[PDB]
Symmetry: C2
Subunit: 248 residues, 2 copies
């Protein structure tokens, strides 16, 4: 049966997928493309004209940022057994976009434009880097409370990026155990093989070989602090999920 | 039943798709996104998580640069009735990549790198802009002589970009008639609505509104002329198709 690592952009997809690959391998992940080989990102596969079997006989582990209800996922409607929904603080996601885009905390003008768009969209809708991901609460709802709407046979386990970072081997095991990949023995090594350090080192090594690759809001202006806080404590599905996963 | 405008990159996809949209509309195409709306490019749809119905009841016209055998197209195996295979001189395709990449005919160093890669790949395999398109003869074979391998019920009509450019209303009609979209009356207007001139004007107008958008080898070095001519007159499937569609 079919499994998904679902995650809204910048939630820590690459890291969790890398850990799950080294765990399954029992070996560190030598090159970046090892992530796409270990837990294929569906968007990646589609770009090449791949499209994994609907109704596989053995367990297949895939990843995506799509909401569960995108038409392309319908082929997996009945075969989807499990979902791991990786979630991260929306504040940090928004800062993460600023970093990956090379914007320093001194181009306030340009940062304000990102945070205002993110606040109005309740996510990344206007960022062209990604498609079909919806807003942040739309994404989570679709993979959690309304998952049966898209995948009637699915069980779901949420995991917060912040709990993964605080206790990597404990939370990884929850995931490994839920996905039924094996014993807790190999979990320690998987964590050690994929630290922030080992990750950057491996990404740089790959970029150089030619291979394919890739805080607070106060510094911004108090009126973006209030605009965020309004959204964070308001009555939308955004606020719902922020409270539910302890981000208020 | 399902139809395809298949075409290797730079073959004139946008232009033929634009003409087919204005023909079907009976009106000019006001904005660039009108092309994707009129004859959706499958890669485009997949990027958003769309995936058109397998086995539609009425005629659906889609476009792609994928070879016919990409796994993602299997969903349309049985429902595919027709293919229009748009083909262009491989020499011009290679020059076209140079233009769209903003390389002047005076950065010979950089041009040589493109032509040498294109010659060795027999197409665009190494250009990251596109994926799943295969080499030039692989692409054509898959949509023509071996089409039944991927789409057992399909009839195919080839059209050369060069014949479209020499006689636009005559060759467009061949396409319109083969796809059974209606009478020859509207063909004249479709051609006039989508000239190189009207096209650039519409693309610039769109870019400005904010909307989403996008000779010879002698000048290069005689040893690339000979490298191309060797390939063009050699014994590979490349040479086969170059002779067959009058590019030798």
């Amino acid at each position: 049966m079919m499994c998904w690592i679902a995650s809204y952009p910048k939630a820590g997809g690459h890291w969790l997928r890398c850990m799950l690959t080294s765990y399954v391998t029992g070996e560190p992940v030598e090159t970046w493309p090892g992530i796409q080989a270990g837990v294929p990102h569906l968007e990646g596969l589609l770009r090449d004209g791949e499209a994994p079997s609907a109704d596989p006989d053995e367990q297949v582990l895939l990843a995506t940022h799509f909401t569960a209800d995108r038409p392309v996922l319908r082929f997996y409607r009945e075969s989807t057994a499990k979902v791991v929904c990786l979630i991260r603080n929306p504040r940090d996601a928004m800062l993460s976009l600023m970093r990956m885009k090379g914007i320093p905390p001194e181009d306030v003008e340009a940062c304000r434009k990102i945070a205002e768009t993110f606040i109005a969209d309740e996510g990344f809708s206007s960022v062209r880097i990604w498609a079909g991901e919806g807003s942040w609460p739309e994404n989570i709802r679709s993979w959690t409370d309304s998952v049966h709407e898209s995948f009637p046979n699915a069980a779901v386990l949420a995991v917060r990026y912040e709990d993964l970072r605080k206790d990597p081997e404990g939370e990884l095991w929850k995931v490994v155990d839920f996905l039924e990949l094996g014993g807790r023995d190999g979990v320690a090594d998987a964590v050690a093989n994929c630290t922030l350090e080992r990750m950057r080192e491996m990404e740089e090594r790959s970029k150089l070989l030619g291979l394919e690759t890739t805080k607070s809001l106060k510094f911004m202006g108090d009126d973006i602090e209030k605009a965020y806080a309004d959204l964070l404590h308001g009555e939308t599905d955004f606020a719902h999920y922020a409270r539910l996963y302890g981000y208020a």
